[PDB]
Paper text:
Here, we describe the cryo-EM structure of Arpin bound to Arp2/3 complex at 3.24-Å resolution. Because the globular domain of Arpin is not necessary for binding to Arp2/3 complex and was disordered in the structure, we thought that a more stable complex for cryo-EM analysis could be obtained using Arpin_CA. The structure of this complex was determined at 3.24-Å resolution, and as anticipated the map was much better defined overall than that of full-length Arpin, allowing for the assignment of Arpin’s side chains. The Arpin_CA density on Arp3 was split into two well-defined segments, one comprising the helix of the C domain (C-helix) and the other centered around the conserved tryptophan (W224) of the A domain. As observed with full-length Arpin, Arpin_CA only bound Arp3, which is also consistent with the ITC results and confirms that the specificity of the interaction is fully contained within this region. Like the C-helix of N-WASP, that of Arpin is an amphipathic helix (residues S194-G207) with its hydrophobic side facing the hydrophobic cleft between subdomains 1 and 3 of Arp3. Contrary to NPFs, Arpin stabilizes the position of the Arp3 tail in the inhibited state. Arpin residue W195 is primarily responsible for this stabilization. It inserts into a hydrophobic pocket formed by Arp3 residues V146, A150, W153, L163, M383, L384, V413, and F414 (inset). Contrary to the initially proposed model of Arpin inhibition through direct competition with NPFs, the structural-functional data presented here support a model in which Arpin competes only with NPF binding to Arp3 and locks Arp2/3 complex in the inactive conformation through interactions of the C-helix with the C-terminal inhibitory tail of Arp3.
Numbering used by the authors:
A (entry chain F): 2 to 168
B (entry chain C): 2 to 289, 320 to 370
C (entry chain A): 3 to 38, 53 to 415
D (entry chain B): 4 to 37, 70 to 380
E (entry chain D): 1 to 284
F (entry chain H): 193 to 226
G (entry chain E): 2 to 175
H (entry chain G): 9 to 151
The structure:
């Protein structure tokens, strides 16, 4: 590799620096425990949003709060087929965001996927395991997009050969 | 000495005078009191009166009184009568959720730092036989996360989300006596801002006073530990740590600090008085996922044996449901110069 | 539009696929998929071409109604659309059926399979009980045509008792009896093995099933039927002829007792299933009693049988007998115990049997998708694109 | 002295009888007569059942007290028609001949329990929401308002929204399950735009509930649209203005001097006001109304608008504690009690 | 399956069951079955005037005039014989089978009845293949609007026959997957030198149809089959027609197959991610 | 609506003589109390 | 529900909870001669083909216990009748089974020991033993007189099909 | 309605109001000194001069953008093999400021700017812990 491992290391370090969340009852709303990065009702509880960019197209925006961190990833999209495969995969996963407990239903503007890790998730899951899951996610999305592209190309080749062989 | 009480996180823990019973909040609206029956911990008491998550537990030893505050905007003073713990309600008059609660050294009052940018100093009024709260409001602008009383039952350290570490005066005339002059200041009315300090940024997760109280120390979310001397012209010394943010800090001696947090192991700091400077002394969980004993963030640290004047064993309670009893005596010979 | 909609009822045993506007489904295929990189996922078969093939492994995607393996479900519906129905999915609306107590997440997966893979212009995931009630309208020739009933949907999985009130299924009172077509087939197979020889071991599941297809009937009284078979043993014992797959020859077996012992386990589950022992009449009574009091009586007056396992002769009539007996006994016991001269109105239980009893759900779906309203109650692909899969969580009912 | 003071709250959920000055009720039991529930919206419909109920209360099994030699305090719902009040008074004086008889609206009892004389009580229960201003400890019937939205209507709306999610529920069979869902998960949103954004873009509001039949249902956004019917009646097809707008209007219809005092002591009561975030939402909406139709756009004087809407933690027994305070701190008076001699005048 | 069969199943099973019952001597059962096939074609298997002994299979095409202009009736009479009957109202071509007058072999009649749409389409193909064989160059191209938004152009030249499908992809994903499939089609002559030459033009009509009213759009692609005398000859005419008249549905079917496989891969990856995430819990 | 009417269309065939041509020898006889 | 006995009378003798119904026995035993043509053994032999499938029987009477005992012996009798060639051989097998001693109620190994009651005394024990043996002999005889088809050489399968079916999942062999 | 479109929370006298009273701001980092250092080949001196006087108190975004651009030009001007030594020439405050500038420069990728910024970030992390990244996240007055 040339710029994948350093990028993943930087993202992992920033996630460790950001996935330090504690339970925080709402200051503005009585008896509510809302993710502060979403409501943004108190500016003191919102951390500075940081960006780690592998190039001008692949980037992770990590914006943290006292009780929540939002991690948005822009997946690599070389060509149109990769673009549609990435978008279709992301909608596939985000439709079942109730199972991906740390996943958003809709991305932030300009980004492909968005994870929302609340203090509750770090309570019920190991934080370093969550960081490892996010990095593993970034790697496997690219791997599976490439696999889908290759599978579609091979499938189209076989379909064309099978149709044309019967003439 | 690691013991895994239960899988879900422990919000907060409090020991008793004999260090034989531990009251913990298992990320729930209940307080579980465990006691040592031989060599194993047996859950022997269950306290169920909070309508929401319990955020702070303290145990006054001499009165054996357990004060519990939670997100339900309530404080309860549990007293052991007969064989059961029964609660007395404490009106806090706070519209937001309470976060931290700490008893006074003389057990006459307790402080509840809450999310309404207030600290409720609550004391018993024998005339009407219900607890009464007085609010410290100015200049607290954000939520108070941590508290720690001065060893004179008057002053009060308060860490707040507004990046400011404060020392106020909680001199309630109806329950206290005249406070002696302290290097923090001489004029001590209730709610008086005795001292402030800060940094460029960072929420204050934990504050703790020294044995004599002339020294305060607070750990901020910006991976910094700060110590303020009242004697040395009210001066603050900042150490920007290279580790993850520290959540709970306690003095163990006059010149030593133990701070634990999201780095999942306690760390030791030394305050050189002559130079008035903090230095990293050495992590207390050097190994023989995470190699440290605590698999998740350590949320609370508290002196177990000897008190703040003769601390030889302390206790770290984490978000992994673990309680670790660290003996600094053994760690003295374990590492090179872990003094 | 102009092209008729596609109605596919994907049951656990038999998938019933066809086009709207038709009385009976054009295909009743087994709900089985035979499967072995590249295009190998298209090298599979469904229906009768998948029961037994040399080099293929057969798998049943649907177990107890709930779809287990969704990939196999997608491939199955793929050849349903393109090999059997021969429909362009972009021009035909689809009326899919859902099992009782189906999770909205499963509705979302079905909608995603239909839309993001086949690009259908519309989809309507209909509850099976309401379709059965719709099919029941062909036998009730009065103005008592309401969607309030107690559907006894019995197939090859579990026999569901489903109370529908005002068109909406009361999901808190649905009760499943683990006796269905497969249990009856197993019982008849065991009876045949213990009585007659000459049954090939590899055909015993089929030669029994055909028996259960053609010679079975519920019995008014077990000992009376046994005495009839013993004494008048010429008009009751039938002869079944079959052809052995290996060494093709004709074999004749005496179809006797199992004729009335096939569906009897609907009425005495302790005969075959040891864990479950209460008759279907008691289950229906308990289901309806669990329902609100204001709707209890309508659920008696409209008990609709759907599925092949309910197509046994006199099954509905005997069910009416048993349910009326238990209801009248309960009423008499209550009157005797209370002694307050309440005198409740006598309860009339009416099990609606109809000529479309077998494919009741598909018939209801066809007559539902043959209407102008279906187009204005479907979920258009445009709605899928704007709102999302959530639109397919609720499919509105009709009058 | 006199003593022998008994206070008996007659709430629809439970009847609670005890003695004056008690921090907690001595006896609590559901208002069950057998199985009938004549208590609908706090107005009696079957008086014989209530006669049996009071006989049970004063019977040896519950209190074992002499009615002719005891002082009784009863709780009256707001907007109680005068016929019911008079008939209850006649029942106390004739069928029980109590020496000390007094009845008052639940609003003043609430304020006495919390320790206030002036303020507005928002008592929302299962039948109807009542907004009752009280000045100098005397309820003001003129300014009291009723909003026909309560726990039952919110439960029905939640059932409708759960059907919209594809959950086979019924309005007559699964009422109690949805009621428990509303108690355990529903809350009042603060900014409905922001809450809707959080529901439609994030899965943090999704919570799993185990129905009695074992099926797990994931209740997400509907946690906050169900109570929103209190603020937006049109969501349940009810003509109105909403609880916050109604409260602001009923305060603004009062004397100019008392408006500031009413603002600072608006107290919530009843089960339907236990929703998280309800006081914050009421404060925000009242501030918005003050900005719109009192300040008329400017924000300079909004900071002077002091509003303190506190839901008391001891909500469960507010009426009983108010009765105990009223019948303990001032029981020894003479002109206060309505006695049988005055009845027989 | 890969190749889309050219036989309508519903007709095949219905007529096979009816003929088996008639041969067995059983009383025929009334049939009233309306259904549809690809290209928006409507079938109706019924009984004329209620007589059970006669079974009528009617086919309705929204474009039967454009085929009738190229000898549709002549082909249908030659292939179906006396079974051709005056069409039912609302339908274009009707076949009548008398259940009392079946021939000895029912397989041929059932299979021909299955090929009803194929023989409706094959008239223009027969005409233009004969045009190529006879050397009648310059004859006007045949335009067939087999669906509302998709079109077809058949042209005969000196040494080749051009068959252009004007297809419309509903979604952008359809468009890109079709681009991939057609790119594989274009270079498919490497593995088979005797195959027809497939050309693809996305968003732009070829120069041949530029003078015509061929639609232009981002979702519209044109697929040109160049068929040589080795494919337009009598021996291979049937197979060539069978494949060419279903190529469009074949391509769309395989696009949807690719989407289904892509969903399978996403489901596998989602399951792997969910297992990884549930392993992160302290208790698993 | 149209659903009720289209379902009823079958009533001419459904509203006819008995399904069984004669119940030929193999079904439980009627005349049971049922 | 499972079919029930119908020949119970208030004057019918009771040995424990066991019921001493009369039979038409040609043999000699404690059971008295019955004028009626219907007996508990015959009623069992009739109802058995439908009772054997029932794995849950409610003992609503005391003649019911007689019914279950005769049904279990019928099950054992068909188990031992599968390997036979003639009516005479079958009857000899029935006599051999009857002359043996299956467990009496109370003794270990007897099915439904929690439903039946132990004999009170030695005289009652002997009466119960003789009654059970007589019922066994009559059951075997009336079984063989009808199991074999009216034409010779046919132990008809219509009763052989029940060989492996145990009433209430219990058998007299264990 | 129409009264729900007003955000009362903004007009409340309880929000955390940052002081923002640093003032000063003497043109931030010096352009001439760093230009002279870069031209003379004193790359380490160029980095040291670039990290002096951060615009931690300047409210205007133009000076912050100028300082970020200067620091970015210095950072890409470096060679990879010589980066590590440079990182070791800064104290805790210097490394924290360098990581703030690195995280600022990631937001504007150009050619191989991100490729060398990732090496800079790795070395800065190695020499200054994860607490430096934490301070980058937490600093309200950040470059
Ligand atoms: N007389 C009969 N009529 C119809 N089916 C019968 C009959 N006797 C036995 N069966 C069998 O009963 C079963 C009924 O299967 P059915 O298609 O109704 O199930 P399903 O697909 O699970 O149904 P559903 O669509 O209601 O969920 C088949 O196995 C069929 O062979
Ligand atoms: N914690 C809670 N959160 C939300 N709603 C609750 C809660 N507890 C109770 N409720 C609801 O509040 C209502 C109970 O009303 P309450 O107990 O005050 O009765 P009430 O005022 O005596 O009634 P009524 O109007 O019939 O006289 C119910 O609708 C119940 O679902
Ligand atoms: Mg089924
Ligand atoms: Mg109330």
């Amino acid at each position: 590799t040339a710029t994948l491992r350093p990028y993943l290391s930087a993202v992992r370090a920033t996630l460790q620096a950001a996935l330090c969340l504690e339970n925080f009852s709402s200051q503005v709303v009585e008896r509510h425990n809302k993710p502060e990065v979403e409501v943004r009702s108190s500016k003191e509880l919102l951390l500075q949003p940081v960006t780690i960019s592998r190039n001008e197209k692949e980037k992770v925006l990590i914006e943290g709060s006292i009780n929540s961190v939002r991690v948005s990833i822009a997946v690599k999209q070389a060509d149109e087929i990769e673009k549609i495969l990435c978008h279709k995969f992301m909608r596939f996963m985000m439709m079942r965001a109730e199972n991906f407990f740390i996943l958003r239903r809709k991305p932030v503007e300009g980004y492909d996927i968005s994870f929302l890790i609340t203090n509750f998730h770090t309570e019920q899951m190991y934080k370093h395991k969550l960081v490892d899951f996010v990095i593993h996610f970034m790697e496997e999305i690219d791997k599976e997009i490439s696999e889908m592209k290759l599978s579609v190309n091979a499938r189209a080749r076989i379909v064309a050969e099978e149709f044309l062989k019967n003439f | 000495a690691y013991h895994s009480f239960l899988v879900e996180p422990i919000s907060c823990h409090a020991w008793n005078k004999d260090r034989t019973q531990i009251a913990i909040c298992p990320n729930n609206h209940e307080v579980h009191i465990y006691e040592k029956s031989g060599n194993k911990w047996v859950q022997v008491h269950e306290l169920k009166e909070h309508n929401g998550q319990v955020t702070g537990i303290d145990w006054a030893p001499d009165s054996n009184r357990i004060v519990t505050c939670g997100t339900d905007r309530n404080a309860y003073v549990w007293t052991l009568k007969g064989r059961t713990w029964k609660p007395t309600l404490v009106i806090l008059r706070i519209n937001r959720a309470a976060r931290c609660v700490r008893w006074a050294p003389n057990e006459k009052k307790f402080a509840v730092g809450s999310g309404s940018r207030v600290i409720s100093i609550c004391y018993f009024e024998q005339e009407n036989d219900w607890w009464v709260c007085k609010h410290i409001k100015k200049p607290i602008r954000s939520t108070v996360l941590s508290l720690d009383w001065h060893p004179n039952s008057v002053l009060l350290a308060a860490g707040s989300c507004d990046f400011k570490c404060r020392i106020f005066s909680a001199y309630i005339k109806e329950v206290e006596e005249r406070p002696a002059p302290t290097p923090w200041g001489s004029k001590m009315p209730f709610g008086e801002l005795m001292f402030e300090s800060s940094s460029s940024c960072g929420w204050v997760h934990g504050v703790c006073f020294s044995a004599n109280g002339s020294r305060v120390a607070w750990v901020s979310h910006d991976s910094t530990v700060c110590l303020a001397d009242a004697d040395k012209k009210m001066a603050v010394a900042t150490l920007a740590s290279e580790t993850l943010p520290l959540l709970a800090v306690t003095f163990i001696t006059e010149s030593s600090l133990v701070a634990a947090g999201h780095d999942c192991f306690p760390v030791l700091f030394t305050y050189d008085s002559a130079a008035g400077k903090l230095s990293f002394g050495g992590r207390l969980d050097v190994p023989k996922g995470l190699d440290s004993l605590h698999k998740n963030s350590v949320s609370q640290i508290s002196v177990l044996s000897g008190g703040k004047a003769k601390c030889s064993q302390f206790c770290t309670t984490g978000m992994d449901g673990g309680m670790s009893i660290w003996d600094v005596r053994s760690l003295e010979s374990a590492l090179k110069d872990l003094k | 539009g102009r092209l008729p909609a596609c109605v596919v009822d994907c049951g656990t045993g038999y998938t019933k696929l066809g086009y709207a506007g038709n009385t009976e489904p054009q295909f009743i295929i087994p709900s089985c998929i035979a499967i072995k990189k590249g295009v190998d996922d298209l090298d599979f078969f469904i229906g009768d071409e998948a029961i037994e093939k040399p080099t293929y492994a057969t798998k049943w995607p649907i177990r107890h109604g709930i779809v287990e393996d969704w990939d196999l479900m997608e491939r199955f519906m793929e050849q349903v659309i393109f090999k059997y129905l021969r429909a362009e999915p972009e021009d035909h609306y689809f009326l899919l059926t859902e099992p009782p107590l189906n999770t909205p997440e499963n509705r979302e997966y079905t909608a995603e399979i239909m839309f993001e893979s086949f690009n259908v212009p519309g989809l309507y995931i209909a509850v099976q009980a309401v379709l059965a009630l719709a099919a029941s309208w062909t036998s009730r020739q009065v103005g008592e045509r309401t969607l309030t009933g107690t559907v006894i949907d019995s197939g090859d999985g579990v026999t569901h008792v489903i109370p529908v009130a005002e068109g909406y299924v009361i999901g808190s009172c649905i009760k499943h009896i683990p006796i269905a077509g497969r249990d009856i087939t197993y019982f008849i197979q065991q009876l045949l093995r213990d009585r007659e020889v000459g049954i090939p071991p590899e055909q015993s599941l089929e030669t029994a099933k055909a028996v259960k297809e053609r010679y079975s009937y519920v019995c008014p009284d077990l000992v009376k039927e046994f005495n009839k078979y013993d004494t008048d043993g010429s008009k009751w014992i039938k002869q079944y002829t079959g052809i052995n797959a290996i060494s093709k020859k004709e074999f004749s077996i005496d179809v006797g007792y199992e004729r009335f012992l096939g569906p009897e386990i609907f009425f005495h589950p302790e005969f075959a299933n040891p864990d479950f022992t209460q008759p279907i009449s008691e289950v229906v009574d308990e289901v309806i009693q669990n329902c609100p009091i204001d709707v209890r009586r309508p659920l008696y007056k409209n008990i609709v049988l759907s599925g092949g396992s309910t197509m046994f002769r006199d099954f509905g009539r005997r069910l009416q007998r048993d349910l009326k007996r238990t209801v009248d006994a309960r009423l008499k016991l209550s009157e005797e115990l209370s002694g307050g001269r309440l005198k409740p109105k006598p309860i009339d239980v009416q099990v609606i049997t109809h000529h479309m009893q077998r494919y009741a759900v598909w018939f209801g779906g066809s007559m539902l998708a043959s209407t102008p309203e279906f187009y204005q109650v479907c979920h258009t692909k445009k709605d899928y694109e704007e709102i999302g899969p959530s639109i397919c969580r609720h499919n509105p009912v009709f009058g | 002295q006199g003593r022998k003071v008994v206070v008996c709250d007659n709430g629809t959920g439970f009847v609670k009888c005890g003695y004056a000055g008690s921090n907690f009720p001595e006896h609590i039991f559901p208002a069950l007569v057998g199985v009938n529930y004549p208590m609908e919206n706090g107005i009696v419909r079957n008086w014989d059942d209530m006669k049996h109920l009071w006989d049970y209360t004063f019977g040896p099994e519950k209190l074992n007290i002499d009615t002719r030699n005891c002082k009784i305090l009863l709780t009256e719902p707001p907007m109680n028609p005068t016929k019911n009040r008079e008939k209850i008074v006649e029942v106390m004086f004739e069928t029980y001949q109590f020496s000390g008889v007094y009845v008052a609206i639940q609003a003043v009892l609430t304020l006495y329990a919390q320790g206030l004389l002036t303020g507005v009580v928002v008592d929302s229960g299962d039948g109807v929401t009542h907004i009752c201003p009280v000045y100098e400890g005397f309820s003001l019937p003129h300014l009291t308002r009723r909003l026909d939205i309560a726990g039952r209507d919110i439960t029905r709306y939640l059932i409708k929204l759960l059907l919209l999610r594809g959950y086979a529920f019924n309005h007559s069979a699964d009422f109690e399950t949805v009621r428990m869902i509303k108690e355990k998960l529903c809350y009042v949103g603060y900014n409905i735009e922001q809450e809707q954004k959080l529901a439609l873009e994030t899965t943090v509001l999704v919570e799993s509930y185990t129905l009695p039949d074992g099926r797990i249902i994931k209740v997400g956004g509907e946690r906050f649209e169900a109570p929103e019917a209190l603020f937006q009646p049109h969501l349940i097809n009810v003509e109105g203005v909403g609880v916050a707008e109604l409260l602001f209007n009923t305060i603004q219809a009062a004397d100019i001097d008392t408006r500031s005092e009413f603002y600072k002591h608006i107290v919530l009561s009843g089960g339907s006001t236990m929703y998280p975030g309800l006081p914050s939402r009421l404060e925000r909406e009242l501030k918005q109304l003050y900005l719109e139709r009192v300040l008329k756009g400017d924000v300079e004087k909004l900071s002077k608008f002091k509003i303190r809407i506190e839901d008391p933690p001891r909500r469960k027994h507010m009426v009983f504690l108010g009765g105990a305070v009223l019948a303990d701190i001032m029981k020894d008076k003479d002109n206060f009690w309505m006695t049988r001699q005055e009845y027989q005048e | 399956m890969i190749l889309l069969e050219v036989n309508n199943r519903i007709i095949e099973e219905t007529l096979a069951l009816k003929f088996e019952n008639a041969a067995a001597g059983n009383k025929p059962e009334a049939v009233e079955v309306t259904f549809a096939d690809f290209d928006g074609v409507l079938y109706h298997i019924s009984n004329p005037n209620g007589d059970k002994t006669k079974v009528m299979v009617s086919i309705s095409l929204k474009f039967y005039k454009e085929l009738q202009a190229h000898g549709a009736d002549e082909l249908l009479k030659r292939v179906y014989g006396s079974y051709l009957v005056n069409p039912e109202s609302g339908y274009n071509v009707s076949l009548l089978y008398d259940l009392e007058n079946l021939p000895a072999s029912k397989d041929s009649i059932v299979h021909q009845a299955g090929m009803l749409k194929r023989n409706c389409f094959a008239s223009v193909f027969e005409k233009y293949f004969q045009f190529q064989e006879e050397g009648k160059e310059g004859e006007n191209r045949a335009v067939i609007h087999y669906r509302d938004d998709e079109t077809m152009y058949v042209e005969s030249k000196k040494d080749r026959v051009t068959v252009v499908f004007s297809t419309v992809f509903k979604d952008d994903d359809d468009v890109v997957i079709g681009k991939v499939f057609m790119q594989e089609f274009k270079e498919g002559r490497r593995a088979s030198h005797t195959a027809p030459q497939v050309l693809f033009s996305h968003r732009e009509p070829p120069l041949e149809l530029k003078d015509t009213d061929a639609a232009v759009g981002d979702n519209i692609g044109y697929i040109t089959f160049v068929l040589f005398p080795r494919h337009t000859n009598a021996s291979a005419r049937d197979n060539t027609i069978n494949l060419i008249h279903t190529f469009r549905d074949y391509l769309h079917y395989h696009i949807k197959c690719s989407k289904a496989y892509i969903h399978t891969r996403m489901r596998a990856k989602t399951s792997d991610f969910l297992k990884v995430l549930n392993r992160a819990r302290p208790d698993a | 609506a149209s659903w009720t009417d289209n379902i009823m269309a079958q009533k001419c065939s459904k509203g006819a003589a008995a399904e069984i041509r004669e119940q030929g020898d193999g079904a439980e006889d009627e005349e049971w109390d049922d | 529900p499972a079919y029930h006995s119908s020949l119970m009378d208030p004057d019918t003798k009771l040995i424990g909870n066991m019921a001493l119904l009369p039979i038409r026995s040609q043999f000699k035993g404690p059971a008295p001669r019955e004028t009626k043509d219907t007996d508990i053994v015959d009623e069992a032999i009739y109802y058995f083909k439908a009772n054997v499938f029932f794995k849950n029987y409610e003992i609503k009477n005391e003649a019911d216990r007689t019914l279950i005992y005769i049904t279990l012996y019928i099950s054992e009798c068909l188990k031992k009748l599968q390997k036979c060639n003639s009516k005479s051989q079958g009857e000899k097998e029935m006599y051999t089974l009857g002359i043996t001693n299956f467990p009496i109620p109370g003794e270990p190994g007897f099915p439904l020991n929690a439903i039946y009651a132990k004999p009170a005394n030695k005289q009652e024990d002997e009466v119960m033993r003789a009654y059970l043996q007589q019922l066994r002999q009559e059951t075997g005889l009336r079984l063989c007189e009808k199991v074999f088809d009216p034409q010779n050489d046919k132990p008809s399968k219509w009763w052989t099909c029940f060989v492996k079916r145990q009433f209430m999942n219990k058998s007299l062999s264990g | 309605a129409r009264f729900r479109k007003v955000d009362v929370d903004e007009y409340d006298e309880n929000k955390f109001v940052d002081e923002e009273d640093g003032g000063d701001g003497q043109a931030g980092p010096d352009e001439g000194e760093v230009d002279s250092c870069l031209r003379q080949g004193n790359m380490t001196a160029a980095l040291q001069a670039a990290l002096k006087n951060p615009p931690i108190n300047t409210k205007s975004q133009a000076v912050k953008d100028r300082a970020g651009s200067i620091v970015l030009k210095v950072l890409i001007s470096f060679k990879a093999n010589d980066i590590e030594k440079a990182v070791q020439s800064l104290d805790k405050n210097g490394v924290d400021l360098l990581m703030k500038y690195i995280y600022k420069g990631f937001e504007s990728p150009s050619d191989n700017s991100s490729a060398v910024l990732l090496q800079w970030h790795e070395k800065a992390l190695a020499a200054g812990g994860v607490g430096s990244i934490v301070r980058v996240l937490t600093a309200r007055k950040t470059v």
